């Protein structure tokens, strides 16, 4: 997260880190046994780390649970990032408390102008690389589709929205992928991609979760 702020320990209790011997992506806890992340974050042997603040220090609110299933959307396109969504089943249920909690799925889509919270342990620099110890947060509005369509040579699919700041300096970045975009207490987005990070006229692009709710419920119910 570039241009964000330190969230505070466990203030985003649905935020998880996906770990393969190092943090590589975020995700969102949606019930005691299931995490939503990005399809482009898929790999074998993921360990889900819940209750994290400082990802480099054992502080005492962590639960580390192996993924038992990592399910990429069947229509994920790795070139366009269309349908950039993955469901992870935990090998055992997480123990839910104030610091480890699920986030609600949306009942409807959010409108342009809605303010959202984006979070993660991704790169905090727009030029070069710096990875934080603690969770970073960014308040960002959903933009109109014409501001994303004009804002990229790749035209935005109906399964994506963009959010953030056309002036530059405030955005998600590498290592934030798969993490949450929460608006009005509902999980509306998944950190998907962008052109660089926090560049002028190049907002962040997010998987539009409201389109996937029935798919998520069905996939969970069958697995």
Which residues are designated catalytic? 40, 84, 177
Size of the site for Ca ion (CB under 5 A): 3
Find where tokens 């727009």 sit. Answer: 126
Which residues on adjacent β-strands are paired with residue 183? 186
Residue with smaller CB distance to Ca ion, 19 or 147 = 19
Helices (H), the chain: 145-149, 213-221
What is the closest distance, in whole angstroms, from the C-beta atom of residue 133 to Ca ion in the complex? 9
What is the closest distance, in whole angstroms, from the C-beta atom of residue 41 to Ca ion in the complex? 20
At 119 the three-state DSSP class reads strand
- Token pair, residue 63, equals 């639960």
Residue with smaller CB distance to Ca ion, 51 or 164 = 51
DSSP 24-74: EEEEEEEETTEEEE-GGG--TT-EEEES-SSTTS--S--EEEEEEEEEE-T
What is the closest distance, in whole angstroms, from the C-beta atom of residue 51 to Ca ion in the complex? 8
Residue with smaller CB distance to Ca ion, 64 or 69 = 64
Residue with smaller CB distance to Ca ion, 59 or 145 = 59
Binding-residue pattern over the window 57 to 86 for Ca ion, x denoting contact by CB under 5 A: --x---------------------------
What is the closest distance, in whole angstroms, from the C-beta atom of residue 53 to Ca ion in the complex? 6
- Residue list 41-60, contact with Ca ion (CB under 5 A): 52, 54, 59
Side by side, which strands form the sheet with 180-183? 5-6, 136-141, 115-120, 180-183, 186-193, 204-208, 160-163
What is the closest distance, in whole angstroms, from the C-beta atom of residue 197 to Ca ion in the complex? 24
At 195 the three-state DSSP class reads coil
**Separation of CA 154 from chain center:** 21
User: Phi and psi of 126, rounded to 5°?
Assistant: -85, -25
> How far apart are the C-alpha atoms of 101 and 116, rounded to whole Å?
18
Give the number of C-alpha atoms closer than 13 A to the C-alpha of residue 152, restricted to the C-beta side: 20
Residues at the contact surface with Ca ion, assessed by CB under 5 A: 52, 54, 59
């Amino acid at each position: 997260i570039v241009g964000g702020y330190t969230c505070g320990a466990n203030t985003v209790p649905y935020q998880v880190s996906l770990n393969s011997g190092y943090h590589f992506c975020g995700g969102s806890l949606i019930n005691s046994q299931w995490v939503v992340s990005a399809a482009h974050c898929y790999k074998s042997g993921i360990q889900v780390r819940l209750g994290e603040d400082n990802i480099n220090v054992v502080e005492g609110n962590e639960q580390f649970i192996s993924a038992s299933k990592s399910i990429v959307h069947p229509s994920y396109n790795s070139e366009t990032y269309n349908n950039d969504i993955m469901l992870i089943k935990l090998k055992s249920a997480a123990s839910l408390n104030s610091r480890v909690a699920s986030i609600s799925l949306p009942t409807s889509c959010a409108s342009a102008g809605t303010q959202c919270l984006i979070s993660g342990w991704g790169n905090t620099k727009s030029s070069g690389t710096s990875y934080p110890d603690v969770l970073k947060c960014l308040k960002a509005p959903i933009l109109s589709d014409s501001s994303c369509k004009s804002a990229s040579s790749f035209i935005i699919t109906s399964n994506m929205f963009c959010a953030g700041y056309l002036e530059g300096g405030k955005d998600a970045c590498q290592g934030d992928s798969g993490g949450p975009v929460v608006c009005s207490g509902k999980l509306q987005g998944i950190v998907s991609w962008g052109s660089g990070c926090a560049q002028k006229n190049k907002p962040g692009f997010y998987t539009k979760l409201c389109n996937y709710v029935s798919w998520i419920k069905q996939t969970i119910a069958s697995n």
